[PDB]
Design a protein around this motif. Sequence first.
Motif: not given
Lengths: 286, 286
Positions: B202-206, B241-252, B275-286
């Motif tokens: 029931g998570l609703r990430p971007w 999308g302007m900034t984004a945080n790596a989500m704290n996803v439940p360990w399970e 575990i990298t936020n935007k900034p400094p990273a992009t969301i995609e890897f390419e």
Amino acid sequence: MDWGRFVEEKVREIRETVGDSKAIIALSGGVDSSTAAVLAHKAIGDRLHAVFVNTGFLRKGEPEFVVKTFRDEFGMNLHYVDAQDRFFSALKGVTDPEEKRKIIGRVFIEVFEEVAKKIGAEYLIQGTIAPNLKLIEPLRDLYKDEVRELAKFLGLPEKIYNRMPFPGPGLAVRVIGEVTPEKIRIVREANAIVEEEVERAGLRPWQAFAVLLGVKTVGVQGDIRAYKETIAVRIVESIDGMTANAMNVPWEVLQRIAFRITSEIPEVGRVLYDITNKPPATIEFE
Amino acid sequence: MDWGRFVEEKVREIRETVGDSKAIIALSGGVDSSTAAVLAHKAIGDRLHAVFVNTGFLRKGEPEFVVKTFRDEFGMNLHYVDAQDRFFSALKGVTDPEEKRKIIGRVFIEVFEEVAKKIGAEYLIQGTIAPNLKLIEPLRDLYKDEVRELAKFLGLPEKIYNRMPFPGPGLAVRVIGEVTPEKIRIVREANAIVEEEVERAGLRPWQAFAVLLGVKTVGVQGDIRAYKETIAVRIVESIDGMTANAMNVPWEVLQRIAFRITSEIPEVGRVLYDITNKPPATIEFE
């Protein structure tokens, strides 16, 4: 256990085997080699020659710490061998992890044989635990827990007796692909941040380290066409290294790690955390 | 706000612009083009030709869903175009992310142009929002949140109007380096697992997706060791999308993802979580 009596007998045993000859021991900073070295030293003092080979692939601060501990605090004959150039040259262009390990082993023996010959030793002390030169293995009947207890009894520092295991090939197997001075530099700094934050957070894992993945990515600040490195953080719990689980590290701890690596190591643009258990994955990446 | 009035007016505007001619639209599955297509269809019916290109890089089940939604349920004049060989063949040997994106753009235009020429439309509908062929942009005054409201009002499925955004080059930018059918197959299944687990919890990430890193690890397959792949899991929270945080996803949830990927996709041996936020990273890897 009756460690005082164990030490007494063992020191006696070594004295009787070695007599007035020289013995040699390789120091890695590991608990096994360290404990064996102190026993042999108590046995034969100045006739023990401890050898520390700086491969260039060691953890941040390790060479200084090993010297300070064994030469300065314990008063051992310590032959410091700066072999960094030799190891980097030997690994130039090597991408196969089995070949890296093979070559590092080969080169270590070369460098160590070179030193041993100048010393004129008759005996080799080794830190073998349960499971040329004559072999003395004072720790042969002891298991890992017992060795740690003895190291404590012998006055070795907590940094050693409680240490997480660190592979012979060192940081060379924590760089995916060909090893270079710069890649080792980056991964060394990342490793230190991981260890620091793990200690800060009171985590007590089996192993905690960083791996430089080789994958590159551009970011969203500064030169947005500059490709930066990617680090994986590997933190596991285990009894023996045989089966292990990825550690459920508190989120704020992972965030601190990711922030510090990207902030303090500008060559790194992305940080990933290994969530894979053993099985199916190895603990090390290579 | 008044969507009934908006629709009535826009439909009239489209009818008045197009008259008895044909119009064409490229359908991406995205909310913008989907909404523009439904409006145009309300306006001119079968004289709207909706072109859906299968690039070969779409998600598991997405082509089936787009066809069902637009052809079967809306009754649109859909051209389903299988262009997979063209896109994969064009990308042979290409590893540079920017070049990959450029080639995919070129090939898309080629494919769309080829189909449009046979259709012989006089008007191009685009889903451009705020802030040859004559262009009609019925959503040009609407903001992103408004477009979603409108899509809902027009009876578009929640799977579209609430969809996580998905790149035009699709899974091709989710494979580090050369895009091949096998790498796409692997990342497609991994992506499905990631989206499935996010939904299950029931998570609703971007955004929530998988990336094939190209990093090999030694796993076991039956009775032998085998080199296996590495997946990165990317899940982020974001306003727009302007900034984004790596989500704290439940360990399970992370554990379900790691377990399923390595068990259901035996070609994959390790799973890493970004575990990298935007900034400094992009969301995609390419």
